[PDB]
Write a protein that binds this ligand. Structure first.
Ligand SMILES: CCCCCCCCCCCCCCCCCC(=O)O[C@H](COC(=O)CCCCCCCCCCCCCCC)COP(=O)(O)OCC[N+](C)(C)C
Ligand SMILES: CCCCCCCCCCCCCCCCCC(=O)O[C@H](COC(=O)CCCCCCCCCCCCCCC)COP(=O)(O)OCC[N+](C)(C)C
Ligand SMILES: [Cl-]
Ligand SMILES: [Cl-]
Ligand SMILES: [Cl-]
Ligand SMILES: [Cl-]
Ligand SMILES: [Cl-]
Ligand SMILES: [Cl-]
Ligand SMILES: [Fe+3]
Ligand SMILES: [Fe+3]
Ligand SMILES: [Mg+2]
Ligand SMILES: [Mg+2]
Lengths: 256, 256
């Protein structure tokens, strides 16, 4: 990981970041016992391998909010910690890899088109999709799961269209066995995200968009622990007589 | 490490701490590349075992500033990361353990009395002292050094008086081989503390004081990387015809 940040820029960021934390300590009268706890908790986060989790839950949303200023296309959201590159490519109309267990869940049929800002459909567009199963697990983050379970890179058609069947996502509880759970527990917080799809949508000569999609009336939409839900990203799927949920959502890309 | 902090209190601290960092990201337009760097750097701090160093250098001073509000006695300062409990007890007039190498350095003869707020001398008072050698090393934090080099707990006399000989401390460069050094390097900062003694001064029925003492006209006093120097804690030792530096400093304790 590299960035082009100048010494001057880092100096300024570091000054107000530290200034800000030091201001919080002064405001609340943080005590030595509390300082000692905080020190050990930071150590524990690293030893538990939880930096990606903690940062993606409590910090990334502000980083996307910065990126969001520069963008006219479909709203972005956090990547979160569970993305895997090079998920196997699938045809424009497809179902994601899943287990026999997953086949017991109500299907979600997700259709739409990738377009530019004027509404023109894009060819060569890809839709990388990943999400949790009904048990609350991500493939590659649960040793029982086939490595691409509920993961794929969908090659859109010459018009930019896709029709992707998956399972209906359910709410996701973040790992609570470690320091991040402990941080949440200690303040009577809620360790839950709403049900969500993760997507990265790309196309030749376009700025990719990393986003998420949520479900109308879903649990936790108004109290997402990661602060990553946006009203523009809430889907309202319709149930057909086959008992499957159907929704269309188009992606709009900014130029690269 | 435990603290008595309520869920309500942690909730509030966490809210403005995170709010504050998120505000800094928004102010400066922190980018995804920069976020990725920050994530890896946090990981590196833990893997390098540098949480105590980083926090004591960049954060502890605000924690002492909180404690300072409650105190009328001699000014405190940060403990920093190098304190060791149960250093061997020494008589009221003593020299700290040192090596033949240390005996090559100009002596510092440090005298005074431990008193209450009215100026009354205290019996049963102890002065725990530790500091770096002229090479920039702390005992127990450098495998070549005898474990109590430049460390001792001085038992003051029935009047609270002490006369402690040590070596004249020299400026201290913080470890720069790791992520903390890298943080400093990346912003064209200075990885230096002024020359300093560390002391913890205690007595029956008194609140102990953890403090530091610095040296008039010393390098880095105005630009201490740890932000821990205070004008009240600057010593002005006088050189005698024996070529030794002499200084008196009295400690004043608040009641427990
Ligand atoms: C991105 C860098 C991260 C930014 C940090 C922002 C968050 C800072 C707040 C987190 C403080 C750690 C609190 C986690 C709960 C720890 C519970 C624990 O194990 O200690 C428990 C103690 O149980 C408790 O009473 C709860 C401890 C609350 C202590 C709160 C300390 C927070 C003060 C430091 C914040 C200053 C930063 C501004 C040990 O029991 P055994
Ligand atoms: C107490 C919890 C700690 C509080 C955190 C406050 C400090 C936050 C600022 C530290 C950011 C990390 C910068 C350390 C330098 C890393 C240099 C490096 O290895 O990357 C280098 C890249 O070289 C560079 O260009 C310098 C990187 C500067 C990146 C700055 C990122 C800071 C943005 C995050 C701050 C947001 C928090 C508010 C890899 O090259 P190989
Ligand atoms: Cl700073
Ligand atoms: Cl591609
Ligand atoms: Cl409805
Ligand atoms: Cl919060
Ligand atoms: Cl004692
Ligand atoms: Cl002078
Ligand atoms: Fe997720
Ligand atoms: Fe020191
Ligand atoms: Mg237009
Ligand atoms: Mg008085």
């Amino acid at each position: 990981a590299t960035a082009d940040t100048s010494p001057e820029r880092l100096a300024a960021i570091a000054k107000d970041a530290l200034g800000a934390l030091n201001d919080v300590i002064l405001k609340h009268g943080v005590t030595y016992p509390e300082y000692r706890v905080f020190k050990q908790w930071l150590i524990d986060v690293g030893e538990g391998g939880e930096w990606p989790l903690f940062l993606d839950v409590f910090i990334e949303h502000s980083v996307e909010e910065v990126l969001a200023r520069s963008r006219k296309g479909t709203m972005g959201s956090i990547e979160g910690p569970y993305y895997i590159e090079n998920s196997p490519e699938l045809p424009s109309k497809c179902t994601l890899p899943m287990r026999e267990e997953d086949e017991k869940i109500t299907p979600l049929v997700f259709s739409g088109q990738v377009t530019d800002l004027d509404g023109n459909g894009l060819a060569g567009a890809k839709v990388e999709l990943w999400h949790a199963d009904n048990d609350g697990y991500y493939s590659q983050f649960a040793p029982h799961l086939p490595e691409w379970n509920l993961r794929g890179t969908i090659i859109a058609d010459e018009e930019g269209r896709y029709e992707i069947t998956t399972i209906q996502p359910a709410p996701y509880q973040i790992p609570t066995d470690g320091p991040t759970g402990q941080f949440i527990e200690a303040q009577n917080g809620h360790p839950w995200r709403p049900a969500h799809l993760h997507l990265i949508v790309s196309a030749p000569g376009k700025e990719s968009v990393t986003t998420q999609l949520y479900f109308k009336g879903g649990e936790w939409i108004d109290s997402d622990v990661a602060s990553a839900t946006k009203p523009e990203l809430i889907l309202d799927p319709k149930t057909g007589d086959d008992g499957k949920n159907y929704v269309t959502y188009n992606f709009v890309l900014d130029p690269a």
